[PDB]
Design a protein around this ligand. Structure first.
Ligand SMILES: [Zn+2]
Ligand SMILES: [Zn+2]
Ligand SMILES: [Zn+2]
Ligand SMILES: [Zn+2]
Ligand SMILES: [Zn+2]
Ligand SMILES: [Zn+2]
Ligand SMILES: [Zn+2]
Ligand SMILES: [Zn+2]
Ligand SMILES: [Zn+2]
Ligand SMILES: [Zn+2]
Lengths: 208, 208, 208, 208, 208
């Protein structure tokens, strides 16, 4: 049966997650987690999707992704780690496209993954240069736009989630901007606020 | 009749624009929009131009170009996006050459395209390095000189448009220069101001 | 009986695979595996195909091909190894042609062989020059088009497999393109995206 | 017998240490000490480890490491010296991995090396910029996590050592933070306290 | 007697080594040393091997190989020198094959030759381009796999030697990777780490 295959995949994935967790070397652990995500998504693509297996696939993806993000917080190069976080998010979005329609549980899981990735990215970007920080900010805003355009749901819930993410981003940016001299302050504030407003317009038209 | 052909081209172009707008991947969307612009210009070159069809052709070009520029604001690599904006402007200038004489409506449309490209370029160049920023500035000033050399119109209107563009450039540059140490400040100020003065001279002699 | 002959061939092939695995020199090992594959295909052509023997033939082909691909990862010249991987894929496609109609198990085996070849090719192509890398990419996209044109199955499964392969290719290409200067970036991006869209068109029309 | 070989190695290492101490140029001395450490570790890996030779190997490694760290305090480029301290610590951790089980004396020696490296790193990082200082802090916290993950011992002793190291780090950080403006203060305090809490969690789970 | 012949070979080999050492031109000296190695191996193949003569043959091979490697460090073309180091290693491996069973002294000599070749290769590859450096790394990892597959010994000693070699390679690679932009960083890290994991799997299966 298909469900039996999915739970076998889940068991093997948890075993591999424990094995990687016992690897004592963070740089070679995140790559193994990414390869595990790739294998899981390949297996998911092999078999046809059904409502009962969607939740199990989402739990597998959520476990692997959260483990990988926390490992990204545990040492390495900052820019490489930010790139890896964005790539994990992109793989999640591709799986979202493949799985099609989602329910409330899948919506919650996807929002959890997005929120964890956002927190990791903000924590890591606190240590970048000015141009790199603002570039990472703009890139993540565009990624949020893509994620909300692919993911479907009731407009009110998506609006609330978007507001929460924007408040997180704004808090970090308003703390960070005080170090960049009053003219670069104006430049970066205009750029970031325009990006946020364009994001709001895009997702609000998506809601309609 | 030529007019029905041009309106059919317009209908097809709007249909393709909607299709591209629903493509969820920005990097593949700008390239498709540029390809659509190329096909539209090839069709325009195929049939001979008349006063009635000029306006319709300009609306098609305006729609495609504005969509492409806004998509350029929506994610990608900064330098590639700036190059693509300059490419869209150059295609518009080549179409202006092909058309020949331009009236008031066509002048207004072309000025709008130029202003949109300038705003996109400034917004994106805010995130570049020093040398790359100044190189982009000089390149866009030269592009403005070429655009005003090709385009014909009343000297006072062109003077007002040129002054507005120069004020935009000067505002962005005067905000940006405060971050580059007082000697590089003198170097870049000399270079940029000389470029602007040469642009003024060239366009004022173009007025004739 | 025919089935007895097929299992005799299978046993001989496994014995030869073990012998080659104990050969300690990779360049001679891949060629010996290719010769074994040729012998197996000749034997398959000699006997008439039946539904029960199709699975056994596919298992033999799968074992030999996966062993040869993993050996291709284990040392040699990069370009020769890429060519050998493509040759193994082409031999599998020719066997697919000779066999004809396939079930779900044969579909899974063929997709697994294709994915193993794709991963080997991407890994080996990371070390090529710009032009060679893009040439290998385009050649493999055309090979994927041929493979999907020859292989028959339900449109949804083929669409999912194609999407997964395209995501893999886009992953590697988007990591690689950041080293080739913002103008070659535009050139290669246009070329590769046009190739991918043409592949999508061909495959989707094949599905219908 | 292995033992007399190990004391030969010890005699040669001490002779080379004296020779390097008489070299009057600090940049060439740290590199020579690192080469000597590499040679000693190669010799150690050559022969199989025994309980009696473990102590002698640890005394040799402790002598070389302490000499190299003190030489790192005696002049050079700050960032290169911090990097070299981290690499000495990483070599000690790799030797910990190779040896395996560690007794009380080896535990004391390893903690001595770790504490010396920490004090050197804090002293040198006192002269860095804000971003570089906080990056070095986070890197060393992750290195402490790796060191405690590899090294085994009674939970209470490891807890006490961890508390001592954290008090050292916190004292230096609380002195340093008063110079970075009240908003960057909040940013860096959040980041550093989160890193310390993660370190505590990881180590305490390792103890269990 | 055979032993007398072997010591005659040794005496003339040392005489030739001194003559070559007095040659003042390194390019002609490495080729002469390689020719001397070829002559020695031909002589060794001429007479049948015995337990007593194996050690003497290994001392001759070790002397010639170490002299040739150090000369490779003393000037020439970087790529040609790396190739020549690999050829010296391959000749040593072929001699290992022809000799057969290996004791502890021969194991020690072979490991020393391998380590000398590895250090020469790392030192010379420090000055290559990105693609050439990674290609040399992958080639040497495959050569290490071949060497450990041909050479026989107790699993623990081979495991320790392999771990030391991997730490050497990782040290050089982690110093080098910081210059290649964060996306090529991910690409090369995935490639190299996968190669190292495959090497570990291969030799650990060989140990069993
Ligand atoms: Zn952690
Ligand atoms: Zn939040
Ligand atoms: Zn937008
Ligand atoms: Zn304006
Ligand atoms: Zn292998
Ligand atoms: Zn894949
Ligand atoms: Zn001192
Ligand atoms: Zn202390
Ligand atoms: Zn020399
Ligand atoms: Zn070494």
């Amino acid at each position: 049966n298909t469900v039996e295959k999915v739970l076998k995949v889940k068991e093997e994935a948890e075993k591999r997650i424990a094995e990687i967790e016992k690897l004592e070397n963070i740089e070679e652990a995140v790559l193994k987690l990414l390869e595990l995500l790739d294998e899981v998504i390949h297996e998911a693509a092999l078999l046809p999707i059904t409502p009962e297996t969607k939740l199990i696939w989402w739990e597998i993806i959520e476990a692997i992704a959260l483990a990988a993000l926390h490992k990204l917080l545990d040492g390495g190069n900052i820019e490489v780690n930010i790139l890896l976080a964005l790539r994990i998010l992109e793989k999640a979005i591709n799986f979202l496209k493949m799985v099609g329609m989602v329910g409330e549980k899948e919506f919650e899981i996807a929002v959890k993954i997005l929120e964890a990735a956002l927190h990791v990215v903000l924590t890591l970007s606190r240590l970048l240069n000015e141009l790199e920080f603002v570039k990472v900010l703009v890139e993540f805003i565009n990624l949020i736009a893509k994620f909300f355009k692919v993911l479907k749901g009731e407009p009110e819930k998506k609006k609330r989630v978007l507001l929460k993410l924007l408040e997180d981003i704004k808090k970090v940016f308003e703390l960070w901007i005080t170090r960049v001299n009053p003219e670069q302050q104006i430049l970066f504030t205009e750029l970031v606020y325009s990006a946020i407003e364009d994001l709001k317009k895009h997702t609000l038209e998506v809601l309609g």
